[PDB]
Each structure stands twice: as C-alpha cells, then as structure tokens.
Amino acid sequence: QVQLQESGPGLVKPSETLSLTCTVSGGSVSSGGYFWSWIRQPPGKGLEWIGCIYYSGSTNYNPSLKSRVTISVDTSKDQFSLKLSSVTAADTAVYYCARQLWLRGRFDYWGQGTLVTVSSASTKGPSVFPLAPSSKSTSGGTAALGCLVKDYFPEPVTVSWNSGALTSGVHTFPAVLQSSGLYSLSSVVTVPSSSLGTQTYICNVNHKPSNTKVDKKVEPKSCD
Amino acid sequence: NFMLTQPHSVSESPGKTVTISCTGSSGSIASNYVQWYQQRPGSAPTTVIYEDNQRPSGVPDRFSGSIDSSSNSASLTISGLKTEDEADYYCQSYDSSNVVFGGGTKLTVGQPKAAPSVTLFPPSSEELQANKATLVCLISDFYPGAVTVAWKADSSPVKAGVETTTPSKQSNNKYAASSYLSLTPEQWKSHRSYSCQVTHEGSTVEKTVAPT
Numbered sequence: 001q002v003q004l005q006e007s008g009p010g011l012v013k014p015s016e017t018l019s020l021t022c023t024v025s026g027g028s029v030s031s032g033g034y035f036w037s038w039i040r041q042p043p044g045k046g047l048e049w050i051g052c053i054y055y056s057g058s059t060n061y062n063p064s065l066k067s068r069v070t071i072s073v074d075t076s077k078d079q080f081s082l083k084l085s086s087v088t089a090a091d092t093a094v095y096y097c098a099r100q101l102w103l104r105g106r107f108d109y110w111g112q113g114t115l116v117t118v119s120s121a122s123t124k125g126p127s128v129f130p131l132a133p134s135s136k137s138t139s140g141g142t143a144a145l146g147c148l149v150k151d152y153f154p155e156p157v158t159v160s161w162n163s164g165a166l167t168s169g170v171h172t173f174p175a176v177l178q179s180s181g182l183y184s185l186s187s188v189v190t191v192p193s194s195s196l197g198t199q200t201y202i203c204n205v206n207h208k209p210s211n212t213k214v215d216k217k218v219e220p221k222s223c224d
Numbered sequence: 225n226f227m228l229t230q231p232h233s234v235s236e237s238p239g240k241t242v243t244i245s246c247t248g249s250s251g252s253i254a255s256n257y258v259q260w261y262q263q264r265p266g267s268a269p270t271t272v273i274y275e276d277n278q279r280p281s282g283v284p285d286r287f288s289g290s291i292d293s294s295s296n297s298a299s300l301t302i303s304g305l306k307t308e309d310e311a312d313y314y315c316q317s318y319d320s321s322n323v324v325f326g327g328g329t330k331l332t333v334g335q336p337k338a339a340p341s342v343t344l345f346p347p348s349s350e351e352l353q354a355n356k357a358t359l360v361c362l363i364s365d366f367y368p369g370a371v372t373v374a375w376k377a378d379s380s381p382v383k384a385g386v387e388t389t390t391p392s393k394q395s396n397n398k399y400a401a402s403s404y405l406s407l408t409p410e411q412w413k414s415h416r417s418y419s420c421q422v423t424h425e426g427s428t429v430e431k432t433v434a435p436t
Contacts, residue, residue, distance in 0.1 A: 037323070046230075046328040047261070047269065047314050060321045096268060104318035105275070106259045110268035129351040131360060136431055137343050144343040148351075148360055150404075171364060173402045176389050184387060184404055186360055188343075221346070223436040 002027035004097050004111030008081075011119040011154055011209075018084035022097030022111060023077075030055040030075050037100050037107065038071065038082050040093035040116075048093065052103065053080060089118045119154055120181040125212040126152035128205045131188065132221035138193050145196075145218045146188030147203035151178070152210070159187035160204045196220050226251040226319045228298075228326040235332035238305040244329050246298035246315035254293035259316035260300050262287075262309075269314070273300065305333070338398045340366030340424040346433040347412060357412045359433070361403035361420035366391075368425070369399035376419040 008020040022038075029036070037052035051061040051069045061069045070083040084091070095114050098107035131146040138144065149157050161170055169190040175183040187203065201218045229247035236242050246258065258276045263269035273279055273289050276298070288301045298315060310333065315326035340363045347357040363371050369391030375382035385406035391399040403420060412418070412435060419432035 041269075047325045049323040049325060052323065062322060102257075103321075103323075104257050106271045106316070107261075107269075108271060110270065112268055127351075127354065127356070129358065130348045131345040132348060133343075133345065134433075136433060137345055139341060139343065139431075144362070146345070146360075146362075148348075148358060148404075150356075150358055171394065171400050173362075173389050173400060174392055176387050176402075176404075178387055178406070179385065184358075185389070186362070186402055186404075188362060188364075190364075221436070224349075 002099070002109065004099050004109060006095065006097050006111050006114045008114070010115055011117060011123075012087050013119050014088055016087055018087050018091075018116070019081065020084075020095055020097075020114065020116070021079055021081035023079040024099070029073060029078050029080065032101075035100050035103060036073070036080050037098045038069075039096045039098045039107065041096065041113065042093040045093075050082070052100070087118060092117050117154060121153060123209050124151070124153045124182070125210045126150070126157060126205060126207045126214065128203070128214040128216045130216050130218050131186065132219060133196060134221045141192060142190050143193040143196060144188055144190050145201060146186050147205060147216055147218060148184075148186050149205050150184040151182045152184075152207055153182055154209055155183065157185070158206045158208075160206075161187070161189050162202060163204060166201070225249070226317070226324055228315050228317055228324055230313070230315060230327035230329050232327065233330040233332065235330070236305060238307070238333055240305060241301065241303040242305065242331075244300040244302070244313055244331075246300070246326050248296050248298070248317065251317070251319060252293055253291055253296055253298045253317075256318040258289070258291065258298045260287075260289060261314045261316065263312045263314070265311070272313075302331075305331075335367050335397055337425065338365055338367035339427075340364070340371055340401075340422055340429060342420070342422045342429045342431055344420055344431040344433050346418075346435065347407070347409075352409050352412075355409060357407040357409050359405035359407060359412075359418055359420070361405070361422070363391075363401040363403070363422050363424075365394065365396070365398045365400070366424055367398050369393070369401075370424075371401055372423045373401075373403040374421050374423070375403070375405050376421060377415045378417055378419075382418075 006022045038050040073080040097111045099109040100107040129148040133145040175185045259274045261269040262272035286303045290299045313329040387404040389402040421430045
C-alpha cells in the first residue's frame with residue numbers, strides 16, 4: 001500500500017516561520033490524480049482544516065488561515081511541505097498530513113500526527129533537585145521519595161529510577177507551565193521505610209533536546 | 225460561514241443504541257457529502273463512515289449514518305456499544321472549496337473512591353545553594369480525581385508561586401496529582417513551618433515541613 005510520514009522540527013518560536021514536510025512512501029504524488037491536504041488538531045479540541053493542494057499549482061486555504069499558508073509540492077523528492085507564517089501561541093496543534101482523493105470526500109489514509117509546541121525563550125537544561133524523605137514524609141509502614149525536575153524547556157523529559165530497575169510504585173506526572181514560561185514536574189517512588197538507610201535510590205532525568213543527562217542520588221534528610 | 229454543530233458529550237451504557245447529530249447552520253446537509261471520523265486519543269483519525277450511508281470495509285455494520293435534510297441535522301446511528309467505541313467523533317463537509325469539520329462528540333459509557341495519600345518534602349540544600357527553593361506537595365492513590373490544594377505559611381495561605389497538576393490516572397486505576405510552591409531561600413527560613421493541605425471528598429489530609 002502507501003503511507004504518509006511527516007518531518008520537520010516539533011518546535012517553533014512565536015512570530016516565526018513553520019516548516020513541516022510530509023513525505024510519501026509506496027506511491028506517486030503526481031499519479032492517481034490524488035489530492036493532498038493538511039489538517040491540524042489542538043489538544044482537547046476538534047479537527048481544523050488548513051488547506052489542500054493538487055500536484056499542480058491548484059491550491060485552496062481556510063478563510064481563517066488565509067494569506068498565511070504556503071504549501072508547495074516537489075515531485076522529484078515525492079513529497080509536499082507546508083509553510084506557516086506569523087505563528088502564535090494559539091497555533092499549538094497536532095498536525096496531520098492527509099492523503100485524500102475526493103475534495104468533498106474523505107482523508108482515507110492519515111499520517112501520524114507530529115506535536116507542535118510554540119517554543120518560548122529557548123531550549124534550556126533542567127535543574128534536578130533531590131526530594132529527601134523524612135519522618136513527616138512517611139504515613140505508616142511506607143515512605144515516599146523522589147526527584148524534582150524544574151525549570152526546563154522544552155517537553156518532554158524522561159525520568160527513570162535505578163536505570164529502570166525500579167518500576168513498581170513509580171509515578172510520572174505531567175508537566176505544568178510555571179509563572180514564567182518554563183516547565184516543572186517530578187517523579188516519585190513509594191518504598192518501605194525499612195529500606196531508607198540501607199538502599200540507594202538514584203533518579204535518572206534525561207532531557208534530549210538540551211542534551212543533558214543528570215543522575216541525582218536521593219538520601220534521607222540530614223538535619224543541620 | 226457554514227459550520228457543523230455537534231454535541232460535546234454523548235454517554236450511554238454499552239449494548240444500547242445512540243444517535244449522534246451533526247447540524248449545519250447556513251448550508252443544507254443534502255448539499256454536500258458528510259464524512260464521520262472516529263479517532264483514538266493519541267492516534268491518527270480513521271474514517272468510520274463516508275458518503276453518508278455506506279460503511280467502509282473494516283468497520284462493523286453497526287456504524288450507520290442517516291441524513292435528515294428537513295432539520296439540517298446529519299445523524300450517525302451506533303448500536304451495541306463496546307469498549308473500543310469510546311472515542312472522539314467528528315463530522316465533515318465541504319461547503320464551497322473550504323472543508324469544514326464538526327465540533328466533536330465525546331462518546332462515553334465507575335471506580336471505588338480512593339483516599340488521597342499525601343507526602344511532603346522540604347527544598348533541598350543543593351537547590352538552596354542555587355538560590356532557589358521549591359516546596360513539592362504530591363497527592364496519589366485517590367479517587368475521585370478532584371482535589372483542591374492550598375499552601376500554608378504557618379497559618380497564612382500561600383498563592384504566589386503555586387503550581388499544581390491536574391489529576392492523572394495511575395496504574396492501579398487510582399489518580400495522582402502534584403503541587404509545587406516556588407519560593408525564595410530567605411522566605412523559606414522566614415516562617416517557622418510550611419504546610420500543604422489537600423481536601424478530598426470533604427476530608428482534609430495535612431502534612432507540615434520545617435527548616436531543619
């Protein structure tokens with residue numbers, strides 16, 4: 001059969017130019033008289049139609065997105081790309097390139113949606129802080145310890161405990177936007193209180209876009 | 225200015241029949257073809273029906289669509305609801321050289337309440353050496369996933385620098401949440417104690433930390 005694969009960076013800064021390219025494998029763009037369209041979908045919102053293209057210069061855009069969408073077809077590389085201008089923070093949506101044959105019909109084959117998040121400031125490294133358990137941090141026969149992942153950009157961050165050895169009781173929480181741009185989250189694991197001073201727990205926070213791997217040991221609080 | 229009006233939330237028990245509407249404002253539904261898209265969360269949409277009455281090869285017969293051009297509302301009838309049918313439903317049109325989608329329907333069909341275990345940690349010395357401080361309050365293993373957080377500085381409530389996370393489903397069917405209080409190192413030692421209070425189903429679970 002045929003398939004659609006999108007490319008391009010998953011980040012864009014406000015008031016910049018977006019460059020997302022969708023490539024086709026297993027078929028021909030010019031043959032079959034097959035249209036091509038781009039469809040975006042914000043998280044938690046409905047699908048939004050951006051525009052559609054033919055293998056020739058025929059094109060059409062949504063009236064809300066008019067005079068901002070620039071889509072071109074390059075037959076030689078067998079792919080088509082979409083350029084967006086004056087991107088804002090409200091443009092955060094999952095972009096799907098949609099192989100569709102009938103203009104009033106359906107997008108029979110859907111490509112996988114790439115996540116686009118308007119990048120703020122710049123890609124910055126995370127600040128990992130230990131989360132020391134104590135007598136007030138335990139309720140019963142079990143205790144909770146973790147690691148704080150604060151002030152990083154962009155999403156996502158992968159946190160593993162003891163290089164993936166500890167998985168039971170490990171909770172990874174979704175990120176939340178801080179008061180000024182940056183993100184913050186944490187990852188914690190619940191362990192019995194008997195293994196506090198006898199077992200070593202090391203969190204492994206990885207931030208691929210900033211190329212930073214931080215291993216932080218978690219120990220009980222030392223009162224000073 | 226042609227839009228497709230769809231119900232936001234439609235919930236019924238499995239095994240029964242439901243009707244999902246798609247209403248056009250200006251243009252008639254019989255003017256253009258109507259395409260219904262059924263999409264998993266975190267997955268590409270798949271067309272559950274097109275051409276307003278004919279079912280694609282691969283979907284079951286239960287996905288039936290009908291057109292009522294008198295009321296300008298397009299209907300999609302689903303019978304015998306199952307687990308995999310819990311997804312978003314979108315209806316599509318064409319207008320005039322401008323593809324218009326629908327609002328989106330939350331097809332829906334149930335867990336024992338769980339107590340919100342709450343733990344607290346003080347800011348670390350390494351963070352203090354970085355001229356920063358953050359108090360982390362965490363809520364876990366609770367149901368229903370509706371909790372309210374309120375930081376306390378000894379007795380005064382704290383609102384500035386408070387960042388909290390929406391409840392998220394855990395592996396054991398319960399919910400998990402977090403709360404973060406960004407703070408200065410001088411303000412951390414200014415007050416005698418800092419406490420985070422979690423209210424869930426009327427009951428309140430409180431823990432406190434102090435600079436030690």
